[PDB]
């Protein structure tokens, strides 16, 4: 019995991944971004989309 799961590594991957599942069906094609950073300027959050 083999299992293929699409969930992201806890952190950003899982968020991107959860977007992928919520807003698109399986077999769908789209762009994802490897490296996310907090900005040197304009940011006070320490948070990232």
């Amino acid at each position: 019995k083999l299992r293929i799961i699409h969930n992201g590594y806890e952190g950003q991957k899982r968020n991107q991944c959860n977007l992928m599942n919520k807003y698109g069906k399986l077999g769908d094609k789209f762009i994802v971004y490897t490296s996310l950073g907090v900005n040197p300027n304009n940011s006070s959050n320490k948070l990232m989309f």
């Binding site: 950073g37 907090v38 900005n39 040197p40 940011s43 006070s44 320490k46």
Partner: protein, 48 residues
């Protein structure tokens, strides 16, 4: 010239105050600029 005329105690407390105010300015400069954007360095503590 001002520093030269000092006994050892005022000297010790001098190098002390200097190093303290210096660490303050140097670190806040290294946070504001010259820090790699990758590491999230927004606070003194984060610099630590």
């Amino acid at each position: 010239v001002l520093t030269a005329g000092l006994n050892s105690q005022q000297a010790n407390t001098l190098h002390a105050f200097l190093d303290e105010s210096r660490s303050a300015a140097l670190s806040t400069y290294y946070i504001r600029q010259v820090a790699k954007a990758a590491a999230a360095i927004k606070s003194r503590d984060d610099l630590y």
